[PDB]
Design a protein around this ligand. Structure first.
Ligand SMILES: *[C@@H]1O[C@H](CO)[C@@H](O[C@@H]2O[C@H](CO)[C@@H](O[C@@H]3O[C@H](CO[C@H]4O[C@H](CO)[C@@H](O)[C@H](O[C@H]5O[C@H](CO)[C@@H](O)[C@H](O)[C@@H]5O)[C@@H]4O)[C@@H](O)[C@H](O[C@H]4O[C@H](CO)[C@@H](O)[C@H](O)[C@@H]4O)[C@@H]3O)[C@H](O)[C@H]2NC(C)=O)[C@H](O)[C@H]1NC(C)=O
Ligand SMILES: *[C@@H]1O[C@H](CO)[C@@H](O[C@@H]2O[C@H](CO)[C@@H](O[C@@H]3O[C@H](CO)[C@@H](O)[C@H](O[C@H]4O[C@H](CO)[C@@H](O)[C@H](O)[C@@H]4O[C@H]4O[C@H](CO)[C@@H](O)[C@H](O)[C@@H]4O)[C@@H]3O)[C@H](O)[C@H]2NC(C)=O)[C@H](O)[C@H]1NC(C)=O
Ligand SMILES: *[C@@H]1O[C@H](CO)[C@@H](O[C@@H]2O[C@H](CO)[C@@H](O)[C@H](O)[C@H]2NC(C)=O)[C@H](O)[C@H]1NC(C)=O
Ligand SMILES: *[C@@H]1O[C@H](CO)[C@@H](O[C@@H]2O[C@H](CO)[C@@H](O)[C@H](O)[C@H]2NC(C)=O)[C@H](O)[C@H]1NC(C)=O
Length: 627
């Protein structure tokens, strides 16, 4: 096919076109991006005196363990404690382990920070060392540190000890441990609370993020980060919704919450940790506020909304307000960040198309209040576009789609026929999830993708060429979900996967990275792809340099050739770069073969006329200079 490139751009490509979508799903927060290594670290939101309350914790030797509603808790936000007892007649190390989130990576080049709170509930004559450390799951110590404690310590007391492993471990089958000498400790009971173990963090931020995952997200070149959900914003009930203020301040004051994916969230990954990560990566937020609906189907009545509207104002003031003018902004300053963070976009709810009978009044009352407080913020509606009809008129809508790979190439013209009437569109969740059009949310045996494939990435890439062509009205787009702990999965496929030690970059991750890192600020019209065809492209240009990015998706099973005609330009470079992602249709990166499918980069001859043979199932980027 001949592709003629117009020398005259038609529109500016928004800085926000490509970004990330985050909620805590598949242990993407706790167990994932958040660097904490201990699972169930503070017994949050579990029932005392049950096996489930002891999840992740195990005795060493003859230790007796129980999670209690402490009569004197470390904080009222953390009402549960681990009650540890050593039987009479004991000797040798006695204590307990935490298995982590399906393991702990033990690396000799890392310093770890361990901490805990303890008290003796009944004063005793105990005198001895409290040892903390890392061990193999077979019981051999890889790192330890200790401090002397006394049974007269009846007040809650924090222990802080660094760890330096004697060796990296051969695998991630390791645990954190706490022990005392069982002879010195025979007959003792100690209450513990608020444990923590951190590795080094991204940008050395206190309470920060896991380095390999954070670096992988930054590798993609995202411009925005949509958070904190997604379904995990909503709660099952009003009482279980995400609340910003429960996520800020000391970990001693963060109660945690049951999220929407079967597990407790610590809320250690809280609003300030999110915002610091944005600052550290150059991303800007698309921040959601809770909007009076939760996933059990209850909408708050209109006459109940006012306190929740104020909570959303408070959330936004934490991000951007002048510290002198509100308590939430003063709080941000008190926590070390007096400057406002960037915030241009706020999303009102999540997927309110499921609660469209109430969204008109919820949207009206939230946005009337929030826009008057923040005239400069753009508010994004979450119902289906234009049905129901909202007041005030939304400036933006968030569109979500989960579909087959084929649907994505077939629907690359989704936005071409939309009106240009001032509305912009955020494709806030999309992914090709299954080959079974009639059971998209089913099992792997019925066509669900366990991991992205070449097929799914290439169909997505064809749809993304349409997002980019239509970027006069499409301002932002993010794949979902972003992250997956391969040992605790609630949804597939996911963009980036990991276990306790390593990261897997999917086929779809490479398509996202190829699009985001090779994106100009000018859109150059070209011959249109066939509407419904397998072969699609989009051309952009960097105004400052003339770097010109030709992105090509062949989402079908046969090779196709393209003859590029750039004769309208004054000059085109004699060489260009080529980046190609391709492989078998159903190939994936997996924990067993994590680099099965990776892009290949080369240099090729170009000029005002050149030809490219696009392999079956490929995503390609050709970069030339034009003027
Ligand atoms: C920018 O441009 C867009 C596109 O033109 C404008 O979008 C239109 O907005 C109006 C509201 O302002 C929508 O009107 C409502 O239409 C429904 C009937 O919907 C059905 O028929 C429509 C054709 O008339 C059709 O477009 C619809 O298709 C959509 O939904 C289906 C799936 O549902 C989907 O398959 C399509 O892809 C579309 O997503 C649909 O089949 C009607 O019932 C409404 O009437 C109620 O509301 C009015 C006003 O309050 C009231 O007077 C009535 O009494 C009644 O209570 C209403 O007329 C129209 O659907 C939108 N079109 C599309 C294509 O989305 C948009 O308004 C522009 N914005 C700006 C800022 O100018
Ligand atoms: C995150 O922030 C949200 C707000 O955005 C917090 O949620 C709000 O929490 C408050 C406090 O729980 C709550 O206000 C109460 O509503 C109660 C239920 O209606 C009222 O009974 C209660 O009034 C009593 O307490 C006030 C002090 O809080 C008094 O000043 C008032 O006179 C009442 O006093 C009676 O009761 C108290 C015991 O509560 C007793 O000591 C007195 O002697 C007297 O008998 C409050 O007004 C809001 O309704 C919540 N709002 C929303 C939107 O959820 C949330 O708790 C924060 N999370 C964290 C972790 O801090
Ligand atoms: C045991 O933990 C303590 C406390 O973290 C470690 O001491 C710190 O060591 C660092 C590195 O030298 C110093 O910068 C701090 O000033 C020390 N703090 C205190 C309170 O002493 C100690 O190194 C650890 N020991 C082992 C064997 O890991
Ligand atoms: C976490 O998931 C990983 C990846 O699936 C598991 O490791 C695989 O385990 C199977 C069965 O033991 C082996 O046949 C594979 O070769 C393993 N793959 C890799 C890449 O190591 C791991 O066992 C899981 N961890 C837990 C604790 O369940």
């Amino acid at each position: 096919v001949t592709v003629t490139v117009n020398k005259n751009p038609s529109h500016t490509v928004p800085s926000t076109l490509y970004g990330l979508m985050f909620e805590d799903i598949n242990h993407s927060g706790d167990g994932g991006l958040y660097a904490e290594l201990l699972q169930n670290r503070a017994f949050q939101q579990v029932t005392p005196n049950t096996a489930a309350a002891l999840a992740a914790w195990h005795p060493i030797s003859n230790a007796k363990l129980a999670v209690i509603q402490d009569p004197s808790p470390v904080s009222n936000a953390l009402p549960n404690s681990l009650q540890f007892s050593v039987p009479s007649g004991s000797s040798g190390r006695v204590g307990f382990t935490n298995e982590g989130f399906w393991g702990i990576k033990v690396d000799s080049t890392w310093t770890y920070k361990a901490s805990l709170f303890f008290r003796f509930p009944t004063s005793s004559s105990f005198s001895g060392a409290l040892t903390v450390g890392l061990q193999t799951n077979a019981g051999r110590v890889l790192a330890q540190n200790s401090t002397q404690i006394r049974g007269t310590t009846t007040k809650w007391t924090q222990i802080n000890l660094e760890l330096h492993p004697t060796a990296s471990a051969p695998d991630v089958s390791n645990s954190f441990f706490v022990t005392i000498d069982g002879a010195a400790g025979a007959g003792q009971t100690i209450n513990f609370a608020m444990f923590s173990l951190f590795p080094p963090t991204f940008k050395n931020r206190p309470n920060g993020l896991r380095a390999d995952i954070a670096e992988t997200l930054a590798e993609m070149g995202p411009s925005f980060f949509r958070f904190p959900g997604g379904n995990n914003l909503e709660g099952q009930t009003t009482a279980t919704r995400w609340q910003w203020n429960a996520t800020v301040g000391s970990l001693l004051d963060r109660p945690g919450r049951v999220g929407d994916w079967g597990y407790v969230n610590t809320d250690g990954l809280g609003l300030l940790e999110y915002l610091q990560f944005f600052e550290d990566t150059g991303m800007e937020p698309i921040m959601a506020v809770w909007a009076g609906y939760s996933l059990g189907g209850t909408s708050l009545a209109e006459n109940q909304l006012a306190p929740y509207i104020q909570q959303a104002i408070d959330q936004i003031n934490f991000v951007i307000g002048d510290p002198a003018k509100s308590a939430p902004a003063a709080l941000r300053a008190s926590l070390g960040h007096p400057e406002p963070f960037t915030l241009r976009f706020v999303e009102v709810g999540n997927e309110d198309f499921f609660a469209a009978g109430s969204y008109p009044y919820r949207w009206h009352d939230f946005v009337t209040a929030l826009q008057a407080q923040f005239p400069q913020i753009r508010f994004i509606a979450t119902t289906n576009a234009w049905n129901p009809v909202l007041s005030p008129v939304p400036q933006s809508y968030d569109v979500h789609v989960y579909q087959t790979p084929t649907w994505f190439y077939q629907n690359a013209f989704y936005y071409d026929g939309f009106q240009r009437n001032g509305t912009t569109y955020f494709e806030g969740e999309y992914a090709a999830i299954s080959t079974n059009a009639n059971d998209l949310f089913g099992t792997v045996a019925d066509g669900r993708l366990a991991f992205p494939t070449v097929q799914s990435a290439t169909g997505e890439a064809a749809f993304m060429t349409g997002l980019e062509r239509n970027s006069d009205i499409v301002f932002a787009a993010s794949y979902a979900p972003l992250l997956q702990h391969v040992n605790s999965t609630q949804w597939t496929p996911d963009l980036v996967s990991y276990d306790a030690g390593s990261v897997i970059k999917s086929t779809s991750f490479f398509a996202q990275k190829l699009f985001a890192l090779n994106k100009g600020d000018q859109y150059l019209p070209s011959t249109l792809p066939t509407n419904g065809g397998t072969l699609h492209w989009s051309i952009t240009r960097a105004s400052s340099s003339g770097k010109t990015f030709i992105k090509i998706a062949n989402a079908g099973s046969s090779a196709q050739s393209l003859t590029f005609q750039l004769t309208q330009f004054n000059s085109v470079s004699s060489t260009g770069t080529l980046q190609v992602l391709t492989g078998p249709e159903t190939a994936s990166n997996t924990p067993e073969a994590p680099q099965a499918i990776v892009p290949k980069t080369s240099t090729i001859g170009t000029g005002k006329t050149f030809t490219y043979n696009a392999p079956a199932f490929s995503v390609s980027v050709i970069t030339v200079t034009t003027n």
